[PDB]
Design a protein around this ligand. Structure first.
Ligand code: W6H
Ligand code: W6H
Lengths: 300, 237
């Protein structure tokens, strides 16, 4: 179990760790988060009490280094940083735990929610999306735009998601215009899964990473990307059975975890109705369709 | 964006454009089978592709053989239309390729956009106008060449005959649409109007009769009366 210590908490802020969150008052004696499960990526994220604009945060993996948070009063935000001095870090953390100034990552033992949301999200793969190679952790916020969004403006601060575009030469083989547009199996299986992604696990990870940035930061381009990667599979007539089964599980937990009050902006009515009711895979998403109909029947 | 009453004059400026109408591409008769079921029998059709500035009409005849052994024909018809329009553009010299293609029905936008991905600088647009181009199979010489075809075939037609020698494209298009609207609302009456007088003939290389200016005005009036009429007969007004 790993620890992300905080130097201090000078401004009132709501702190998230994965799907948990807690309020820290201005200059409250708070020095971090302890008992973080090893083996998963994690996101630690922030919304200032003053300016609910800009949710922001840090993707990280505690196996990749010792990380802490420190408020920067010039840039005005909580910054993740890496401590290279191992003995200095253990010494810092042990003192803060002795004085009990840390919140415990509160995992219930029956609960596989985080694993289920992150099964295929790696930290090294996450670095391909967020280019800032000098850090082992990745910064994301509400307003960052995607590579495809800039095509339609700062490239250093972009989300490099896989560009998916159903009306593109990449998606459409010359001479198969109708076939490829109505049955996207060629674009799923050859272009994306065999050409850019290699296996069906990498494909799922980008899709999962897209969802979590949408949910935690309200990042709109990530929401577009999630729905695109779902639609590409639902609109393919030929999808390996194992990928469909896994897809239904993936989506099931995404829908389960989504804040009830955010469904109106995070869920695309058109994509979901098409996927569940019209697409080739309309009968292949039993768990996802059951939870969507019981929890968000309005959308449908 | 879309084409409507407010930007109507763009049709007659000097940027090449084509209207594409797919209404008559897939045509069937419906009939009863010996077992008392219903079956369709396809008949020949046509794509109506028109330069509104020049009158130049590229009439691609859709021979019934293209449907043989195919499913979901109404949907295939839109993709076949898009494929043939795309082939047409690619066959034209660059300086003759359109800068815009305006589709008369919105279901053609995606089929055509996908077939024209190689031409990113050609704009594919819908329209809010209810253009009567479905009535082009009421023009005897066009209907005749579609029904006689035994194979796929492209026939070039000038839908304005020689009118541009005497009138502007704006007026020529307005005459054409008035004639097509009448033929669509009441074909027999409209055809009666056009041909009542045996002394006015249709030249062998024309579609419509050789009316003088004064006669076209009378004709145009009669078509407007017909259209207002049928609208009463229809709505009881
Ligand atoms: C430049 O594009 C990429 O790097 C996308 N590909 C092809 C991946 O495999 C990434 C998967 C992934 C992303 C977050 S968690 C997993
Ligand atoms: C004057 O009456 C005519 O019939 C003359 N036309 C046919 C033309 O000059 C060319 C038409 C055309 C060209 C490409 S597609 C149609």
């Amino acid at each position: 179990m790993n620890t992300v210590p905080f130097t201090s908490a000078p401004i009132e802020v709501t702190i998230g760790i994965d799907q948990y969150s807690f309020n820290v008052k201005e200059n409250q004696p708070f020095h971090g988060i302890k008992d973080i499960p090893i083996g998963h990526v994690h996101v630690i994220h922030f919304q200032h009490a003053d300016n609910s604009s800009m949710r922001y945060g840090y993707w990280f993996d505690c196996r990749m280094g010792n990380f802490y948070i420190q408020y920067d009063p010039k840039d005005g935000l909580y910054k993740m940083m890496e401590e290279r001095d191992g003995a200095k870090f253990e010494n810092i953390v042990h003192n803060f735990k002795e004085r009990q100034m840390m919140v415990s990552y509160p995992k219930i033992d029956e609960d596989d929610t985080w694993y289920n949301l992150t099964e295929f999200v790696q930290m090294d793969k996450i670095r391909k999306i967020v280019r800032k190679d000098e850090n082992q952790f990745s910064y994301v916020d509400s307003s960052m735009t995607t590579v495809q969004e800039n095509e339609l403006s700062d490239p250093a601060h972009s989300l490099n998601y896989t560009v998916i575009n159903f009306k593109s030469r990449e998606a459409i083989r010359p001479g198969h215009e109708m076939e490829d547009f109505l049955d996207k199996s060629y674009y799923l299986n050859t272009v994306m899964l065999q050409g850019i992604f290699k296996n069906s696990s990498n494909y799922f990870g980008e899709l999962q990473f897209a969802f979590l940035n949408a949910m935690f930061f309200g990042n709109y381009g990530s929401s577009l990307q999630w729905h695109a990667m779902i639609e590409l599979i639902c609109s393919s007539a030929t999808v390996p059975k194992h990928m469909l089964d896994k897809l239904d599980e993936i989506l099931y937990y995404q829908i389960k975890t989504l804040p009830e009050q955010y469904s109106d902006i995070l869920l695309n009515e058109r994509v979901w109705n098409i996927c569940l009711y019209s697409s080739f895979q309309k009968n292949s998403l039993h768990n996802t369709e059951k939870i969507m109909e019981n929890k968000y029947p309005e959308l449908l | 964006g879309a084409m409507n009453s407010s930007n109507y004059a763009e049709l007659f400026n000097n940027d090449i454009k084509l209207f594409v109408d797919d209404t008559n591409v897939y045509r069937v008769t419906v009939h009863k089978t010996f077992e008392g079921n219903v079956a369709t029998k396809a008949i020949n059709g046509c794509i109506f592709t028109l330069n509104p500035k020049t009158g130049h009409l590229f009439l691609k005849i859709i021979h019934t053989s293209v449907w043989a052994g195919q499913k979901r024909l109404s949907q295939l018809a839109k993709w076949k239309t898009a494929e043939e329009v795309s082939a047409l553009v690619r066959s034209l010299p660059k300086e003759e390729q359109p800068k815009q293609i305006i589709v008369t029905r919105k279901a053609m936008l995606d089929p055509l956009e996908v077939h024209m991905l190689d031409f990113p600088n050609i704009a594919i647009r819908p329209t809010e106008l209810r253009l009567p181009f479905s009535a082009a199979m009421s023009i005897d010489k066009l209907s005749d060449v579609v029904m006689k075809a035994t194979e796929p075939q492209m026939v070039l037609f000038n839908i304005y005959d020689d009118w541009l020698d005497r009138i502007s494209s704006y007026t020529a298009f307005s005459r054409l649409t008035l004639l097509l609207r009448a033929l669509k609302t009441n074909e027999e009456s409209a055809k009666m109007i056009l041909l009542s007088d045996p002394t006015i003939t249709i030249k062998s290389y024309h579609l419509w009769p050789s009316f003088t200016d004064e006669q076209w005005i009378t004709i145009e009036s009669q078509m407007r009366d017909l259209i207002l009429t049928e609208y009463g007969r229809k709505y009881n007004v």
